[PDB]
Amino acid sequence: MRRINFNDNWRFQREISTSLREAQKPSFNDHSWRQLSLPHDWSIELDFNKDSLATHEGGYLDGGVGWYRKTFTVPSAMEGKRISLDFDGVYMNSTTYLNGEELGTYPFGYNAFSYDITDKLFMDGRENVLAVKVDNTQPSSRWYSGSGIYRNVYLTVTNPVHVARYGTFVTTPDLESAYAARKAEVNIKTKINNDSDAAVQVKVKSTIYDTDGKEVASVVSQEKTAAAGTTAHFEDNTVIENPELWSLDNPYRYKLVTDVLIGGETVDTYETRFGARFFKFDANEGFSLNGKPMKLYGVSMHHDLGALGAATNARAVERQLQIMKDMGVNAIRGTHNPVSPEFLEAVNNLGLLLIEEAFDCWSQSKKTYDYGRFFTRWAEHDVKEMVDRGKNEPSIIMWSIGNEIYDTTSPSGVETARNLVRWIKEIDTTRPTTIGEDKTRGDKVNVTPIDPNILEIFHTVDVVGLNYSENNYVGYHEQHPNWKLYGSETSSATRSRGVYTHPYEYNLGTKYDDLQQSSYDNDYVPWGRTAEDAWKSDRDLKHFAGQFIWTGFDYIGEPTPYYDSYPAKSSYFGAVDTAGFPKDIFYYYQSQWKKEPMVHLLPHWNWTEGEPVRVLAYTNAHQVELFLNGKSLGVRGYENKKTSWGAPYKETKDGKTYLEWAVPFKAGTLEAVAMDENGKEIARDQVTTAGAPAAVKLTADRKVIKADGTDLSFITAEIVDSKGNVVPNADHLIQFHLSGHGELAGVDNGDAASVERYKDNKRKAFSGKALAIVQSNKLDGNITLHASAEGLSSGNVTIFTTA
Ligand SMILES: OC[C@H]1O[C@H](O)[C@H](O)[C@@H](O)[C@@H]1O
């Protein structure tokens, strides 16, 4: 194989009481060290520590120094091959050693890096010792980073003359024009490294295959010299007749196979997946993909996977992005760092657009040990690494040079901005540059005069991202009629799943004794807005390309507004909780963003007889009729309204994007019947009063998973009454017992204020529910999960694994 999985047979230890500096030496004794496979996040395995140097910001989980070692032999069948050690990502400030010699140091925690080890390996089946020091001295992060080799590790094995790392660049110049003539013109730029000790003459064959693997185009380059130790550059054009475009509904990808030819002999082969798609940000019309106008329905996403921590997992990140697509999302912002290759694969396969963001700081640090201290020497390397990694990915539409960068008020920030945009454009000119900027917010009411340095930075990027700055959406468009504006960061409303507090009070950045936030879209940070208010400001403007809400998913750390308020340790900003369980606001976004008729009632229906409950319906239906125990409580209706250019939306005469009743509580069944303008029923939702807790009910999202050692089944554990209604406030401790061909990868409940372990075999329900994550091993067969709780009836589910 050209790329080998190098995840297995590692040893790990944290540096605690005594120095591990000796662990670089091959001879060091690691026989007592823990044995594990990568990927690995050592922080997520630890108990929460209220005294952690990570503070609340990093979720009260310790980092510090840790060491990985791997002792291995090289097969005879690899002599005279080029071998690189490839890390997808190590958080952070790592130093790698082979056979006691330093290969290098890599500061940045969120990029891949590679070391050529061809001339450093012992090839004779003698023992090689690889040592990685990971230095996450804290505080380094405004959110939960994780610590360690949290992404995949590979060997790349090639002949001395080979396609370079990221050695292909497949583009579709003027695709709109070509597509109107029933083709895609495909431009292919190929880099060939000659790592041999002698010049060669080289040709490149480029063959394009469709998803079925039928050849659809091919082209052979001219012959070119590649001197010893140099790169030859090739550029070839070809045509796909009647191309299949990559789109949100049809995320179709072709495969380029590159053959490296020396004297008619193939010495290397290399595959590149790519898609044919065009898009445009328009200063007056907003965004379009392949000529289809649309708003960016976007979310921000951090890199953690909840109970998995930072340790990457293809199924887990795919599940996150499936849930976002189900909310009606079409676009993601990789806040605030390059995403994993598993994340890229998910947006490519699911049909989601992606803004890739390089930096959370430039030179000026946000946290003592963040990247700021490395930026002036490493920025050019890290920004080009992001662009070079991703340039063939159809999902990526924009490169962000930074988020909320303090430097952008200084002449130093202007020179940096110009450098970053120039370095990006040396790698790729086919996607706009952007920035996420918060320092124009001002008083939140009046159009803010732009700082002169920020203004020159807004002229330097191709597309201007505003953070929390609704007061400028119109004024900046009128003052700067060639600007392409979108909301790079919006709302930051805070909410807890199944919590319905201060129903008629709209509070800014307010803490409560419950350590929760309300799901009546009525808690939000002082710089932010309600979900509704951030959306209305966007909805009403054609020129405004769309927005990226803070956030899609909850993440570990930043428990705002509970600053330094242990055990508040993870976020409230997500539409969906860390366990992948939707909050009520998930249904508000469905109601604004999706066409398929839906209706969603809140709150739950376990109250006290007589109490006037605030009842909301999130719906995209014209009207809803509410029923209590089969009797009508009244119709509520929207007006069918039109934006200033005639885009239709539903809103009440009072400006609300939701429907509302005040209901004197009576136990039983509350039902919402959603109807069109003609009174025809198009959707229904109900909530029932739950009785005493009686059972634990298990539901697997997938009952059949692959026996590959990494695939996952996500098991919901609910507390139900004797009729199987979920008990909306239940908090019972669930004890999980797994048997069979699997292990429990983690447990969670989405409770921001829990300091229960993620890496454990028990978890309290939170608002009725907990999660168990089951992982397969390499042997096929059966997994059984048993869930018990004191005084209730147990739950059981079987997972089947196929090989
Ligand atoms: O207090 C922290 C917050 O302060 C500022 O107002 C920023 O705009 C916001 O994004 C930041 O995280």
Active site residue 356: no
* 11-15 contacts, C-beta under 8 A, 24 or more apart: 11/35, 11/36, 11/68, 11/69, 11/70, 11/71, 12/36, 12/40, 12/42, 12/66, 12/67, 12/68, 12/69, 12/148, 13/66, 13/67, 14/42, 14/64, 14/65, 14/66, 15/64, 15/65, 15/66, 15/67
User: Backbone dihedral region of 322: left (phi > 0), alpha (psi from -120 to 50 degrees) or beta?
Assistant: alpha
Q: How far is the CA of 467 from the centre of ligand 1 (A)?
A: 10
Atom of ligand 1 nearest to the CA of 438: 8
> From atom 5 of ligand 1, which residue's Cα is the shortest distance away?
527
Nearest CA to ligand 1 atom 10: 438
User: Structural domain of residue 230, as residue ranges?
Assistant: 160-278
Which two tokens mark 95? 């130093």
Give the residue among 589, 590, 549 at the shortest CA–CA distance from 573: 549
What is the atom index within ligand 1 of the atom nearest the CA of 526?
A: 6
Assign 3-state DSSP to the chain and report helix, strand, coil percentages, each to 5.
15, 40, 45
State how far the Cα of 413 lies from the Cα of 655, in Å rounded to an integer. Answer: 41
Q: Is 505 within 8 Å of 479 (Cβ atoms)?
A: no
Give 527 Cα–ligand 1 centroid separation in angstroms. Answer: 7
**Catalytic residue among 318, 342, 393, 404, which?**
404
Same domain assignment for residues 114 and 169: no
Cβ-based neighbours of 339, under 8 Å, separated by 6 or more: 301, 303, 354, 356
The dihedral sign for the CA sequence 365, 367, 371, 373? positive
Residues 69 and 143 in one domain: yes
Pairing mode, strands 279-282 and 507-508: unpaired
The residues near 398 (Cβ < 8 Å, ≥ 6 apart) are 355, 356, 431, 432, 433, 434, 462, 463
Is the omega angle on the peptide bond into residue 96 within 30 degrees of 0, that is, cis?
no
400 and 501 in a single domain? The answer is: yes
Packing angle, helices 585-593 and 531-539, rounded to 10: 10
527 CB under 6 A from ligand 1?
yes
Q: Do 394 and 373 fall into the same domain?
A: yes
Domain boundary among 646, 677, 693: 693
- Position of tokens 């495909």? 186
Instruction: Identify the domain boundary among 598, 631, 650.
Output: 598
What's the gap in Å between 438 CA and the centre of ligand 1?
8
Residue 276's φ and ψ, nearest 5 degrees, are -100, 110
Q: How far is the CA of 528 from the centre of ligand 1 (A)?
A: 9
Given the CA of residue 439, which atom of ligand 1 is nearest to it? Answer: 8
Rounded alpha-carbon distances, angstroms, from residue 108 to 382, 428, 436: 7, 22, 20
Same domain, 586 and 688: no
**Exposed, middle or buried by CB within 10 Å (0-12, 13-18, 19+), for 283?**
middle
Write the residue with the smallest CA distance to atom 4 of ligand 1. 527
Q: Going by C-beta distance under 8 Å and a sequence separation of 6 or more, which residues neighbour residue 710?
A: 313, 314, 315, 775, 776
DSSP states of 690-722:
--S--EEEEEES-SEEESSSS-EEEEEEEEE-T
Q: What's the rounded Cα separation, in Å, for the pair 73 and 75? A: 7
Q: What is the DSSP string of 109-160?
A: SSS-EEEE-TTTS--SSPPEEEEEEEEE-SS--SS----B--S-EEEEEE-S
**Whole-angstrom Cα Rg for the chain:** 27
Looking at the chain, the number of H-run helices and the number of E-run strands are: 9, 49
406 in contact with ligand 1, CB cutoff 6 A: no
CA distance 110 to 90: 7
CA 108-113-118 angle, to 5 degrees, is 145
> Which atom of ligand 1 is closest in space to residue 527's alpha carbon?
6
Q: In whole angstroms, what is the distance from residue 297 CA to residue 329 CA?
A: 5
Residue 705 C-alpha from the chain's centroid: 22
For the CA of 489, the closest atom of ligand 1 is 10
Relative to beta strand 742-748, strand 769-776 is: antiparallel
Strand ranges for 454-586 from DSSP E: 463-467, 485-491, 507-508, 523-524, 546-550
Q: Measured in angstroms, how far is the CA atom of residue 337 from the centroid of ligand 1?
A: 18
On whether both 66 and 176 belong to a single domain, the answer is no
Breaks (C-N over 2.5 A) in the chain follow: none
Instruction: Judge if the beta carbon of residue 404 lies within 6 A of ligand 1.
Output: yes
Contact 356, 363 (CB under 8 A): no
Nearest CA to ligand 1 atom 3: 527
Please, how many CA atoms are within 13 Å of residue 764, restricted to the half-sphere of its CB? 14
Task: Pick the last residue of a domain from 644, 660, 693.
Answer: 693
Q: How far apart are CA 218 and CA 431, in angstroms?
A: 26
- Opening angle at CA 27, ends 23 and 30, nearest 5: 55
> Which ligand 1 atom is the nearest neighbour of the CA of 468?
8
Q: Which residue has the tokens 């992948």?
A: 580
The best mutation among 439, 490, 525 to test binding of ligand 1, ranked by most ligand atoms within 8 Å of the C-beta, falls on 525
Q: Cα-flanking dihedrals φ and ψ of residue 340, to 5°?
A: -75, 160
| Ligand 1 atom index nearest CA of 404 | 10
- C-beta separation of 95 from 105 below 8 A: yes
Q: Does 407 contact ligand 1 (Cβ within 6 A)?
A: no
Exposure of 297 in the CB half-sphere (CA atoms within 13 A): 20
Q: CA nearest 765: which of 712, 703, 695?
A: 695
**Paired strand residues for 400:** 357, 434
Within this chain, do residues 403 and 551 fall inside the same structural domain, yes or no? yes
d(C-alpha 738, C-alpha 754), whole Å: 23
String of b and e for 419-446 (b: at least 16 CB within 10 Å)? Answer: bbbebbeebbeebbbbbbbbbbbeeeee
Q: Ligand 1 pocket check: which of 55, 409, 527, 555 to mutate, most ligand atoms within 8 Å of Cβ?
A: 527
> Are 560 and 572 contacting, i.e. CB atoms less than 8 angstroms apart?
yes
E strand segments, 478-595 = 485-491, 507-508, 523-524, 546-550
**For 517, left (φ over 0), alpha (ψ -120 to 50), or beta?**
beta
Q: Is 187 helix (H, G, I), strand (E, B) or coil?
A: strand
Taking the centre of ligand 1 as the mean of its atom positions, its distance from the CA of residue 148, in whole angstroms, is 28
C-alpha 214/C-alpha 193 separation (Å) is 29
Catalytic pick among 57, 318, 489, 558: 489
Q: Check the CA dihedral 580-585-591-597 and report its sign.
A: positive
Distance between Cα 498 and ligand 1 center (Å): 27
Q: How far is the CA of 561 from the centre of ligand 1 (A)?
A: 11
Together in a domain, 327 and 254: no
Residue to mutate, 57, 336, 438, ligand 1, most ligand atoms under 8 Å from C-beta = 438
Q: Is the dihedral of CA 295, 305, 359, 396 positive or negative?
A: negative
438 lines ligand 1 (CB under 6 A): yes
- For residue 385 and ligand 1, the question of a CB distance below 6 A is answered with no
* Nearest alpha carbon, ligand 1 atom 9: 527
Q: Is 572 within 8 Å of 494 (Cβ atoms)?
A: yes
Distances (CA, A) of 733 to 346, 380, 750: 34, 50, 14
Give the rounded distance of the alpha carbon of 372 from its chain centre: 23
- Residue 568 Cα to ligand 1 middle (Å): 19
The C-alpha atoms of residue 784 and residue 285 are separated, in whole angstroms, by 54
Nearest CA residue ID for atom 8, ligand 1? 438
Contact 82, 162 (CB under 8 A): yes
Distance, in Å, from the CA atom of 336 to the CA atom of 320, rounded to the nearest integer, reads 17
Assess whether 489 carries a catalytic annotation.
yes
Looking from the CA of 43 toward its CB, the CA atoms found within 13 Å total 35
DSSP labels for 573-594? --SB-TTSPBPTHHHHHHHHH-
Same domain, 571 and 454: yes
Judged by DSSP in three states, 230 sits in strand
Please tell me what DSSP assigns to residue 758: S
CA distances from 395 to 136, 221, 320, 387, 466 (A): 31, 28, 16, 13, 22
595 vs 552: CA distance, rounded Å: 20
Cα of 136 to ligand 1 centre, how many Å? 24
Split into its structural domains, the chain has a count of 5
594 shares a domain with 575: yes
Ligand 1 atom index nearest CA of 441 = 8
Whether residue 112 is found in the same domain as residue 143: yes
Looking at residue 493, the DSSP 8-state letter turns out to be B
Same structural domain for residues 102 and 142? Answer: yes
Q: How far is CA 734 from CA 319, 379, 430, in A?
A: 23, 47, 52
SS3 category, 95: strand
d(CA 523, CA 532): 12
Chain-centroid distance, C-alpha 274: 20
- CB of 287 closer than 8 Å to CB of 295: yes
Residue whose CA is closest, atom 11 of ligand 1?
527
Task: Classify residue 610 as left (phi > 0), alpha (psi -120 to 50) or beta.
Answer: left
